[PDB]
Design brief:
The complex is a heterohexamer, with two copies of chain A, two copies of chain B and two copies of chain C.
Chain A (H helix, E strand, L loop, with lengths): L9 E9 L15 H15 L1 E7 L3 H13 L5 E9 L2 E2 L2 E4 L2 E4 H5 L15 E6 L3 E3 L6
Parallel strand pairs in A: 1-2, 1-3, 3-7
Antiparallel strand pairs in A: 4-5, 5-6
Chain B lengths: L1 E2 L1
Chain C lengths: L8 E5 L4 E2 L2 E3 L3 E2 H13 L5 H15 L17 E4 L10
Antiparallel strand pairs in C: 1-5, 3-4
Helix pairs in contact in C: 1-2
């Protein structure tokens, strides 16, 4: 009664969005190393029991639509949902290959009133992306 | 190292 | 009866607001390396906040940058967990 | 050697970004009522994330607003925990 | 895997309880907040924090209060806690005379600006609005 | 109920 109920037929969906290449208008460089991330995350979450799906070099529209449709699927038999974003970003924002889209709008699809079959279930979002330009020099 |  | 529409989200950011996030072209991003490493060993037996706290620690202590640009030399990183979870989360049973 | 300067912070917000936070004039704010209740019973034996997770649950389930302004009627609230902690935190031993 | 809590003190706890605001700000009285502050005082006192409650602080007073706290010697303390009770908007909290960024209040306690709290937990509890959206809920 |  203090833990999320995990007794479902499946653990749930895991969506990985792996953005390596960007339109040069965006000013963004190639994210070398990200394929190794996506491979490691894939193997890892598959091992946990997730149904893993990997998407590559998505436009902002593709990311919005991809997540919208996932939120419209039937998660009744899933314990939870996970999404992993690998890309460029700035504060509150993440890059598609053709520009930026708010993190708020990607995750809003899974709100309780917009994704009833994930109601009372954990919705996890893992985000590898910059959130600004500040550097941490560290101490000691 | 690189920057995201 | 009712539940907040924003309830039961968890965001695991690779870094804190306003800050940069590091990536090794040869090895992958710091956050993902650490996340996968801890999940492989403890994904099945630790609660999600315990996992991400350990991710926070590993990124914070095991990583420091090298660059020919001194502006980007010997820099550090700390991840950032945002939880609206209402229960403890284990990936088993 | 070094530790990130932003490491080892924890922010316990009464609500999520962009949202309002509610307070009953007679009894106090929802978040504080819940926070104190959980701390009174479990402040010494639970890890801080377990405490705040339970606070999240209490605010989310035990509270719903009443207002004669229908714009503010039957509203809900979920708190928001931001953790840069690198270890587990107990208030004892 | 746990923060070392074997210190002579748990640590300092600052409660900033803002009830009354200058008419210039347009903000109303935060009735109920005194009951919040008293209840919090008892709880954090019971945990072992050395609690002090400040009332109706200006933005400058809040800035100074946290600056002064970050400059104290926390060598024998396990951690630090601060509780903010006020009006607010996203990333900002109200003093009696206006708003101040939350980032600037907490930045004083960064590792490079508060050496005696290095590797120690720094806790901030904030009761305040963060915008104007309302959660209608579901079910 | 009131708003902060």
């Amino acid at each position: 009664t203090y833990q999320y109920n995990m007794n479902f037929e499946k653990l749930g969906k895991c969506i990985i969005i792996n953005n390596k290449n960007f339109d040069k208008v965006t000013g963004m460089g190639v994210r070398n190393g990200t394929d190794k991330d996506a491979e490691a995350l894939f193997k890892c979450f598959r091992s946990l029991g997730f149904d893993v799906i990997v998407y590559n070099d998505c436009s902002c529209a593709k990311m919005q639509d991809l997540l919208k449709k996932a939120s419209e699927e039937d998660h009744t038999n899933a314990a939870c949902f996970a999404c992993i974003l690998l890309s460029h970003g700035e504060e509150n924002v993440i890059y598609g290959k053709d520009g930026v889209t708010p993190i708020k709008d990607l995750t809003a699809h899974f709100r309780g009133d917009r994704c009833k079959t994930l109601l009372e279930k954990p919705k996890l979002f893992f985000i590898q992306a910059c959130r600004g330009t500040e550097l941490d020099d560290g101490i000691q | 190292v690189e920057i995201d | 009866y009712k539940i907040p529409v924003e309830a039961d989200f968890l965001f695991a950011y690779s870094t804190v607001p306003g800050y940069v996030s590091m990536r090794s072209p040869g090895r992958g991003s710091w956050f993902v390396q650490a996340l996968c490493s801890i999940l492989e060993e403890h994904g099945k037996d630790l609660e999600i906040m315990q996992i991400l706290t350990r991710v926070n620690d590993r990124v914070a202590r095991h990583f420091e940058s090298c660059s020919d640009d001194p502006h980007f030399h010997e820099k550090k990183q700390i991840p950032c967990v945002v939880s609206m979870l209402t229960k403890e989360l284990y990936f088993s049973q």
